Design a binder for this molecule. Structure first.
Ligand SMILES: C[C@@H](c1cccc2c(-c3ccc(NS(=O)(=O)C4COC4)c(F)c3)c(C(=O)O)[nH]c12)N1C[C@]2(C[C@@H](CN)C2)OC1=O
Ligand SMILES: [Zn+2]
Ligand SMILES: [Zn+2]
Length: 232
Protein backbone atom coordinates (compact mmCIF):
# COMPACT_ATOMS: atom_id res chain seq x y z
CA UNK A 1 0.00 0.00 0.00
CA UNK A 2 2.84 2.47 -0.80
CA UNK A 3 5.64 1.67 1.73
CA UNK A 4 8.85 0.16 0.41
CA UNK A 5 8.23 -3.58 0.18
CA UNK A 6 10.12 -5.80 2.69
CA UNK A 7 11.36 -9.47 2.76
CA UNK A 8 8.35 -10.99 4.56
CA UNK A 9 5.99 -9.05 2.28
CA UNK A 10 7.18 -10.61 -1.04
CA UNK A 11 6.81 -14.39 -1.60
CA UNK A 12 9.70 -15.93 -3.46
CA UNK A 13 8.74 -15.79 -7.13
CA UNK A 14 6.78 -12.51 -7.11
CA UNK A 15 8.16 -9.09 -7.99
CA UNK A 16 7.11 -5.62 -6.95
CA UNK A 17 8.07 -2.26 -8.43
CA UNK A 18 8.47 0.98 -6.47
CA UNK A 19 8.43 4.41 -8.05
CA UNK A 20 11.57 6.31 -7.04
CA UNK A 21 11.31 9.39 -9.25
CA UNK A 22 9.92 10.37 -12.65
CA UNK A 23 11.02 7.58 -14.98
CA UNK A 24 12.89 5.66 -12.24
CA UNK A 25 11.64 2.58 -10.42
CA UNK A 26 13.28 -0.01 -8.24
CA UNK A 27 12.34 -3.67 -8.52
CA UNK A 28 12.19 -5.90 -5.44
CA UNK A 29 12.17 -9.70 -5.31
CA UNK A 30 12.99 -12.38 -2.78
CA UNK A 31 15.11 -15.50 -3.00
CA UNK A 32 16.31 -18.39 -0.86
CA UNK A 33 20.05 -18.93 -0.43
CA UNK A 34 21.63 -21.41 1.97
CA UNK A 35 18.34 -21.88 3.76
CA UNK A 36 17.42 -18.25 4.41
CA UNK A 37 15.27 -15.79 2.45
CA UNK A 38 16.54 -12.38 1.40
CA UNK A 39 15.12 -9.42 -0.50
CA UNK A 40 17.09 -7.76 -3.28
CA UNK A 41 16.73 -4.64 -5.41
CA UNK A 42 17.35 -3.60 -8.97
CA UNK A 43 16.56 -0.51 -11.03
CA UNK A 44 14.44 0.41 -14.07
CA UNK A 45 15.08 3.66 -15.92
CA UNK A 46 12.91 5.06 -18.68
CA UNK A 47 14.93 5.54 -21.93
CA UNK A 48 12.45 7.38 -24.17
CA UNK A 49 9.89 4.78 -25.21
CA UNK A 50 12.12 1.91 -23.98
CA UNK A 51 13.43 0.82 -20.61
CA UNK A 52 16.92 0.17 -19.27
CA UNK A 53 17.08 -2.54 -16.60
CA UNK A 54 19.76 -2.63 -13.90
CA UNK A 55 20.24 -6.12 -12.41
CA UNK A 56 18.11 -9.22 -12.60
CA UNK A 57 15.57 -10.23 -9.93
CA UNK A 58 17.79 -13.04 -8.54
CA UNK A 59 16.83 -16.08 -10.61
CA UNK A 60 15.18 -17.17 -13.82
CA UNK A 61 11.63 -17.44 -12.50
CA UNK A 62 11.91 -14.19 -10.56
CA UNK A 63 13.26 -12.43 -13.69
CA UNK A 64 10.38 -13.76 -15.81
CA UNK A 65 8.05 -12.40 -13.13
CA UNK A 66 9.92 -9.07 -13.29
CA UNK A 67 9.32 -8.76 -17.03
CA UNK A 68 5.63 -9.52 -16.51
CA UNK A 69 5.38 -6.94 -13.71
CA UNK A 70 7.03 -4.31 -15.91
CA UNK A 71 4.57 -5.03 -18.70
CA UNK A 72 1.67 -4.70 -16.26
CA UNK A 73 2.84 -1.54 -14.49
CA UNK A 74 4.80 0.35 -17.13
CA UNK A 75 4.08 -1.21 -20.51
CA UNK A 76 7.29 -0.21 -22.31
CA UNK A 77 9.80 -2.76 -23.61
CA UNK A 78 12.99 -3.57 -21.75
CA UNK A 79 15.67 -3.35 -24.43
CA UNK A 80 18.95 -3.41 -22.47
CA UNK A 81 20.13 -4.62 -19.10
CA UNK A 82 23.31 -3.98 -17.11
CA UNK A 83 24.45 -6.27 -14.31
CA UNK A 84 26.43 -4.49 -11.61
CA UNK A 85 28.46 -7.49 -10.38
CA UNK A 86 28.79 -11.21 -11.03
CA UNK A 87 26.67 -12.73 -8.22
CA UNK A 88 23.35 -14.49 -8.83
CA UNK A 89 21.30 -11.59 -7.43
CA UNK A 90 22.65 -9.52 -10.34
CA UNK A 91 23.06 -11.99 -13.23
CA UNK A 92 20.70 -14.87 -12.35
CA UNK A 93 18.01 -14.32 -14.94
CA UNK A 94 20.29 -13.07 -17.72
CA UNK A 95 19.41 -16.13 -19.82
CA UNK A 96 15.68 -15.30 -19.40
CA UNK A 97 16.40 -11.68 -20.45
CA UNK A 98 18.42 -12.68 -23.48
CA UNK A 99 15.64 -15.02 -24.68
CA UNK A 100 13.13 -12.19 -24.22
CA UNK A 101 15.10 -9.98 -26.64
CA UNK A 102 16.96 -7.94 -24.02
CA UNK A 103 20.58 -7.12 -24.78
CA UNK A 104 22.61 -7.87 -21.63
CA UNK A 105 25.75 -6.03 -20.60
CA UNK A 106 28.38 -6.12 -17.86
CA UNK A 107 32.02 -5.17 -17.42
CA UNK A 108 34.63 -7.64 -18.71
CA UNK A 109 35.60 -8.25 -15.11
CA UNK A 110 32.02 -9.20 -14.21
CA UNK A 111 31.76 -11.44 -17.27
CA UNK A 112 34.98 -13.28 -16.41
CA UNK A 113 33.95 -13.78 -12.77
CA UNK A 114 30.47 -14.97 -13.71
CA UNK A 115 31.91 -17.44 -16.21
CA UNK A 116 34.50 -18.76 -13.79
CA UNK A 117 31.97 -19.27 -11.01
CA UNK A 118 29.21 -20.85 -13.10
CA UNK A 119 26.74 -17.95 -13.05
CA UNK A 120 24.85 -16.65 -16.06
CA UNK A 121 26.94 -14.48 -18.35
CA UNK A 122 25.84 -11.14 -19.88
CA UNK A 123 26.44 -10.99 -23.62
CA UNK A 124 28.18 -7.64 -24.10
CA UNK A 125 31.27 -6.19 -22.42
CA UNK A 126 31.29 -2.65 -21.01
CA UNK A 127 34.74 -1.18 -21.67
CA UNK A 128 35.98 2.01 -20.08
CA UNK A 129 35.31 0.93 -16.50
CA UNK A 130 38.46 -0.91 -15.52
CA UNK A 131 40.12 1.73 -13.31
CA UNK A 132 38.58 3.08 -10.09
CA UNK A 133 36.93 6.42 -10.73
CA UNK A 134 36.06 5.51 -14.33
CA UNK A 135 32.65 6.46 -15.64
CA UNK A 136 30.78 5.89 -18.89
CA UNK A 137 27.35 6.85 -20.17
CA UNK A 138 24.79 4.16 -20.94
CA UNK A 139 21.43 5.49 -22.10
CA UNK A 140 19.87 7.58 -19.33
CA UNK A 141 22.45 6.59 -16.72
CA UNK A 142 26.09 6.95 -15.84
CA UNK A 143 27.96 3.80 -14.83
CA UNK A 144 30.79 4.30 -12.32
CA UNK A 145 33.44 1.89 -11.08
CA UNK A 146 34.33 2.96 -7.52
CA UNK A 147 36.91 0.28 -6.78
CA UNK A 148 36.62 -3.01 -4.94
CA UNK A 149 33.99 -3.15 -2.18
CA UNK A 150 31.31 -5.85 -1.90
CA UNK A 151 33.07 -7.44 -4.86
CA UNK A 152 36.05 -6.47 -6.97
CA UNK A 153 33.85 -5.80 -10.00
CA UNK A 154 30.97 -3.86 -8.43
CA UNK A 155 29.56 -0.94 -10.41
CA UNK A 156 27.29 1.86 -9.28
CA UNK A 157 24.69 3.64 -11.39
CA UNK A 158 23.63 7.30 -11.34
CA UNK A 159 20.47 8.68 -12.96
CA UNK A 160 21.41 12.35 -13.58
CA UNK A 161 17.87 13.47 -14.52
CA UNK A 162 16.67 12.54 -11.03
CA UNK A 163 19.84 12.55 -8.89
CA UNK A 164 19.26 8.91 -8.05
CA UNK A 165 22.29 6.90 -6.96
CA UNK A 166 21.91 3.13 -7.24
CA UNK A 167 24.73 1.74 -5.17
CA UNK A 168 24.06 -1.92 -5.69
CA UNK A 169 25.61 -4.24 -3.17
CA UNK A 170 28.50 -1.86 -2.42
CA UNK A 171 25.93 0.17 -0.44
CA UNK A 172 23.95 -1.07 2.55
CA UNK A 173 20.65 0.10 3.98
CA UNK A 174 20.53 2.17 7.17
CA UNK A 175 19.20 -0.68 9.34
CA UNK A 176 22.09 -2.98 8.46
CA UNK A 177 24.26 -4.28 11.34
CA UNK A 178 26.65 -6.34 9.29
CA UNK A 179 28.18 -5.92 5.94
CA UNK A 180 25.90 -8.56 4.36
CA UNK A 181 27.47 -11.36 2.37
CA UNK A 182 31.17 -10.58 2.41
CA UNK A 183 32.40 -13.79 0.78
CA UNK A 184 33.90 -11.95 -2.20
CA UNK A 185 34.44 -8.54 -0.61
CA UNK A 186 37.54 -6.41 -0.03
CA UNK A 187 36.82 -4.96 3.43
CA UNK A 188 40.10 -3.00 3.45
CA UNK A 189 39.35 -1.19 0.16
CA UNK A 190 35.58 -0.81 0.64
CA UNK A 191 35.69 2.45 2.63
CA UNK A 192 38.01 4.01 0.03
CA UNK A 193 35.61 2.94 -2.72
CA UNK A 194 32.67 4.45 -0.85
CA UNK A 195 34.65 7.68 -0.41
CA UNK A 196 35.04 7.79 -4.22
CA UNK A 197 31.28 7.43 -4.60
CA UNK A 198 30.65 10.20 -2.06
CA UNK A 199 33.07 12.50 -3.86
CA UNK A 200 31.72 11.81 -7.32
CA UNK A 201 27.97 12.10 -6.53
CA UNK A 202 27.57 14.88 -3.93
CA UNK A 203 24.16 15.91 -5.29
CA UNK A 204 22.54 12.49 -4.97
CA UNK A 205 19.05 12.77 -3.48
CA UNK A 206 18.04 9.11 -3.29
CA UNK A 207 20.49 6.32 -2.60
CA UNK A 208 19.33 2.74 -3.28
CA UNK A 209 21.18 -0.24 -1.73
CA UNK A 210 21.50 -3.65 -3.34
CA UNK A 211 19.29 -5.07 -0.59
CA UNK A 212 16.81 -3.16 1.59
CA UNK A 213 15.34 0.29 1.89
CA UNK A 214 16.39 3.38 -0.08
CA UNK A 215 17.34 6.53 1.74
CA UNK A 216 19.58 9.54 1.28
CA UNK A 217 23.33 10.15 1.22
CA UNK A 218 23.67 8.78 4.77
CA UNK A 219 23.57 5.26 3.37
CA UNK A 220 27.09 5.82 2.06
CA UNK A 221 28.61 6.85 5.38
CA UNK A 222 26.64 4.14 7.19
CA UNK A 223 28.05 1.56 4.79
CA UNK A 224 31.60 2.71 5.45
CA UNK A 225 30.92 2.55 9.19
CA UNK A 226 29.48 -1.00 9.16
CA UNK A 227 32.24 -2.29 6.94
CA UNK A 228 34.98 -0.78 9.16
CA UNK A 229 33.30 -2.30 12.21
CA UNK A 230 32.82 -5.73 10.57
CA UNK A 231 36.50 -5.79 9.67
CA UNK A 232 37.44 -4.57 13.19
C1 LIG B 1 23.85 -14.13 -4.09
C2 LIG B 1 24.64 -13.34 -2.99
C3 LIG B 1 23.99 -13.42 -1.69
C4 LIG B 1 23.43 -14.50 -1.15
C5 LIG B 1 22.68 -14.38 0.23
C6 LIG B 1 22.64 -13.24 0.90
C7 LIG B 1 23.27 -12.02 0.42
C8 LIG B 1 23.44 -10.74 0.94
C9 LIG B 1 22.96 -10.18 2.03
C10 LIG B 1 22.90 -10.81 3.32
C11 LIG B 1 22.34 -10.26 4.37
C12 LIG B 1 21.71 -8.99 4.23
N1 LIG B 1 20.93 -8.06 5.16
S1 LIG B 1 20.97 -8.53 6.85
O1 LIG B 1 20.65 -9.92 6.91
O2 LIG B 1 19.84 -7.66 7.43
C13 LIG B 1 22.54 -8.04 7.47
C14 LIG B 1 22.92 -6.72 7.38
O3 LIG B 1 22.88 -6.58 8.80
C15 LIG B 1 22.60 -7.88 8.94
C16 LIG B 1 21.69 -8.41 3.04
F1 LIG B 1 21.09 -7.15 2.87
C17 LIG B 1 22.27 -8.95 1.99
C18 LIG B 1 24.25 -10.08 -0.19
C19 LIG B 1 24.78 -8.81 -0.18
O4 LIG B 1 25.40 -8.41 0.86
O5 LIG B 1 24.89 -8.13 -1.34
N2 LIG B 1 24.42 -10.98 -1.19
C20 LIG B 1 23.95 -12.17 -0.88
N3 LIG B 1 25.98 -13.95 -2.89
C21 LIG B 1 26.30 -15.26 -2.74
C22 LIG B 1 27.88 -15.29 -2.48
C23 LIG B 1 28.63 -15.79 -3.71
C24 LIG B 1 29.44 -16.48 -2.80
C25 LIG B 1 29.52 -18.01 -3.13
N4 LIG B 1 30.91 -18.54 -1.98
C26 LIG B 1 28.59 -16.06 -1.68
O6 LIG B 1 28.12 -13.89 -2.13
C27 LIG B 1 27.08 -13.07 -2.38
O7 LIG B 1 27.02 -11.89 -2.22
ZN1 LIG C 1 26.99 -9.87 -4.34
ZN1 LIG D 1 23.94 -8.47 -3.11
Amino acid sequence: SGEYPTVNEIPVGEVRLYQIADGVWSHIATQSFDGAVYPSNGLIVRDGDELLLIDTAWGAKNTAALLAEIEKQIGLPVTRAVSTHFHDDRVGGVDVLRAAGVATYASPSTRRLAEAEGNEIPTHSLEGLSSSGDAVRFGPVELFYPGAAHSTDNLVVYVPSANVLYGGCAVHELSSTSAGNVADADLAEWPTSVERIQKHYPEAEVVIPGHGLPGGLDLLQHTANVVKAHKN
